[PDB]
Amino acid sequence: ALKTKPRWDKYDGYVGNYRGVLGEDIDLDTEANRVLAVGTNSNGAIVVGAGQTGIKGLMIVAVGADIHGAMLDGGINNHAGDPQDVGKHGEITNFQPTVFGRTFGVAISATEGNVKLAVNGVDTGNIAYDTSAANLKSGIVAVDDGFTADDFTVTGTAPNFTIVTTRTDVTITASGEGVTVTEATSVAAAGTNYYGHADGTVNAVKGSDGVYVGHTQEADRLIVNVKDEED
Amino acid sequence: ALKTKPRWDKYDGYVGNYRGVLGEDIDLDTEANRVLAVGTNSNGAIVVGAGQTGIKGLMIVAVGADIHGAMLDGGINNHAGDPQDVGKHGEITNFQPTVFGRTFGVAISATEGNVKLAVNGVDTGNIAYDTSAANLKSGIVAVDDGFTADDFTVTGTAPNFTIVTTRTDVTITASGEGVTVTEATSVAAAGTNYYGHADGTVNAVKGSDGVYVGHTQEADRLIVNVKDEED
Amino acid sequence: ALKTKPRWDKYDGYVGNYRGVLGEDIDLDTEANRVLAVGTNSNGAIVVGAGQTGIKGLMIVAVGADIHGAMLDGGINNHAGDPQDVGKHGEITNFQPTVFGRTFGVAISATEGNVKLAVNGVDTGNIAYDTSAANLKSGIVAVDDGFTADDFTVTGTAPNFTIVTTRTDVTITASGEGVTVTEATSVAAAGTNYYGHADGTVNAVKGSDGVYVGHTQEADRLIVNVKDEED
Amino acid sequence: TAPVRQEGIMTQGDLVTVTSDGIDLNALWNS
């Protein structure tokens, strides 16, 4: 079939790889069949992203799709109060960096005047050269669509702008001359360290909040060795 | 039984959990049936608290009480040179924090220069808005009970103080009006990070010496993942 | 069963009720199980609304839904080049007026001061107390959603207006005091003349383009007598 | 067959069963 899904390859269960119960419902369309960084909240309960404790493990919510790719909500491992296994020590095969939403690198080559971006295939109107980050954000969210001041973050005030988007269904692309846009894709890299984040995302970048979760070997595999978050 | 005791629920014995020998006698009344933070001394031997290496694991010295509630000293797992098992990875059930000795918060409520504590059931003499580390300490130990200026440590300012004792039998109480005494208490919290200390104690507070040993899931269960102390 | 679909109750087929072929696909979400005013295009083909010939008949595209209310696209009577039946003389039972999009009657009720309207629960900000139809329309499309300048039509004077939307997802309401909005629902009326329009809609109103199709008797049963459109 | 390789522990949701529209997918492995 066209796709492979991240799975535990080795997981023992007697070694501080722990059972718990979810504190919240898993969002199947965004979070099923993915490598989630997890913590625990002020109850005894597993949460996606940092809880009260910070990041304590990795979790894969291995639900099943039909032949048309739909997932059943009647499952027993998805809802608040369902039991779920969490790992600190093991191996994940068919590994993928886990990310929510979209991000775009914008490089502007117009030396003066104005350029146009196309947010969701329709134009911003004029964005000037050397705009402030807030003015570029304004010129994006000013487009006549459903995407607001909070569907977006914008940064990188030099000609190198960076756009970050909470939702999956927005594409940002070039339209006027003197502007270039690249979607900043993410894929597993061989021989690379991976990091949990307070969001629950898992990727090759330790920012300000990243917790070391493991390292790859060959790109399709991750050797899990979580250095538990602490105060 | 009237009360529950800490135990390893999961412990494998390969994967970093290790046999050693005790370097010192375990004090059964103070240190048996409790979660101890351990290191290793300048020999091959397990010690309670930080040895030469710092904290390297958790240990539970499991000892039976007889039908009268008394522990037998003729055991084979608790003297110097006896073997013991140290966990870095696992789960402990019926978990609770480990503290040694007693501590009493004292607060004086009356403005008058006259209040009476009682030490182990006999009155201490007249106390005022005393200097803690001298006048309140001397006022405590100036009793013919056979306790002395080494059994106690006294700290804090004129309206509030703490008495700390290494001994478990010495017991502070209010006796006169104008003063209140609370013995401090410690209990497990759900979803909380736990730390070992150079003293061998295990609690939710990372001081200047705290070494991360695990996190609680539900409050009765500790997930153990000792991030070994290092130079 | 929850709903009744419109159907031919009497249709003879030798009396100038005629077979044709569709010239365009029928939109199953919008045009199946409805009473369509049809014409002929410049080929031999049936089209919804006024083709070349004007309105020449009524058509019902009967399609079965599944147990979940979804219609199959693989049908034999829906696509361009499929055969279909068109009526001039007969009866339609379970009759309903056939409308596309939505319509909203709007009235101001303030003495003075700007008023606020919502589109799918999202506010316009301010509409002028003496607003023109154009400034009401611009204030409506200025809302931060996908709906554009061509999705809306507006007519009226400052004390009272009608908003008409071509798509059926857009909902107009009043956000606060000083203005009121009502959705102008269409339903079968007894003893009423019906009129096919150039869009393919049937309703009780003769506009500038209405061509008579029938009259309702008791409201559920249109008596069909198409007075064909002419040049 | 395609060069696609699932690995790891087979779990619920890696199951193949008769579909809701009655296709016995477990008959099709030898195809």
How many other CB atoms sit within 10 Å of the CB of residue B182?
12
Q: State this model's resolution in angstroms.
A: 2.4
Q: Name residues 70-109 of chain A within 8 A of B (Cβ).
A: 88-89
DSSP string, A101-156: SEEEEEEE--SSSEEEEEETTEEEEEEETT--HHHHHHHHHTSSSS--TTSEEEE-
Single-letter code of the amino acid located at C145: D
Measure the CA–CA gap between A77 and A66, rounded to whole angstroms.
17
With H, G, I as helix, E, B as strand and everything else as coil, classify residue C25: coil
Measure the CA–CA gap between C156 and C131, rounded to whole angstroms.
10
A75: which chain D residues are within 8 Å (Cβ-Cβ)? 13
Measure the CA–CA gap between B151 and A195, rounded to whole angstroms.
49
Residue B37 dihedral angles phi and psi, to the nearest 5°:
-80, 125
Instruction: For residue B159, give Cα distances in angstroms to A189, B64, B132, B165, B193.
Output: 62, 44, 10, 20, 33
Chain centroid to CA A115: 30
With H, G, I as helix, E, B as strand and everything else as coil, classify residue C179: strand
Nearest to B198, CA basis, from B52, B25, B29: B52
**Kind and range of the H or E element at B137?**
helix B137-141
Chain centroid to CA C212: 16
Output the six-digit token pair for A102: 């979209």
Single-letter code of the amino acid located at A100: F
Measure the CA–CA gap between A214 and A193, rounded to whole angstroms.
6
Output the six-digit token pair for B178: 């104008």
Distance in Å, alpha carbon of A44 to nearest chain B alpha carbon: 4
Instruction: For residue C12, give Cα distances in angstroms to C44, C56, C88.
Output: 22, 17, 10
DSSP string, B176-227: SSSEEEEE------TT-EEEE-TTS-EES---SS-EEEEEESSTTEEEEE--
Chain centroid to CA A113: 35
Residues 6+ apart with CB under 8 A from C91: C8, C9, C10, C221, C222, C223, C224
Residue B16: exposed, middle, or buried by beta-carbon count in 10 A (0-12, 13-18, 19+)?
middle
Q: What is the DSSP letter of D26?
A: G
Contacting chains of A (3 CB pairs or more, <8 Å) are B, C, D
**Kind and range of the H or E element at C136?**
helix C133-141
Contacting chains of B (3 CB pairs or more, <8 Å) are A
Instruction: For residue B164, give Cα distances in angstroms to B103, B158, C116.
Output: 4, 17, 68
Single-letter code of the amino acid located at C113: G
D7: which chain A residues are within 8 Å (Cβ-Cβ)? 7, 9, 93-94, 220
Measure the CA–CA gap between B61 and B35, rounded to whole angstroms.
8
Contact C170, C147 (CB under 8 A): yes
Nearest to A63, CA basis, from A7, A1, A3: A7
Contact A98, A202 (CB under 8 A): yes
Method of determination used here? cryo-EM
Nearest to C191, CA basis, from C172, C217, C224: C217
- Residues A201, A203, A207, A210: is their CA dihedral positive or negative? positive
Residue B72: exposed, middle, or buried by beta-carbon count in 10 A (0-12, 13-18, 19+)?
exposed
Measure the CA–CA gap between C32 and C187, rounded to whole angstroms.
18
Strand partners, C73: none
Q: Do chains A and C touch (3 or more CB pairs under 8 A)?
A: yes
Q: How many CA atoms lie within 13 A of D1 on its CB side?
A: 8
Output the six-digit token pair for C189: 């009326």
Contact B44, B34 (CB under 8 A): no
Measure the CA–CA gap between A22 and A20, rounded to whole angstroms.
7
Instruction: For residue B126, give Cα distances in angstroms to A45, A50, B152, B175, C91.
Output: 51, 53, 18, 11, 109
Output the six-digit token pair for C226: 């198409």
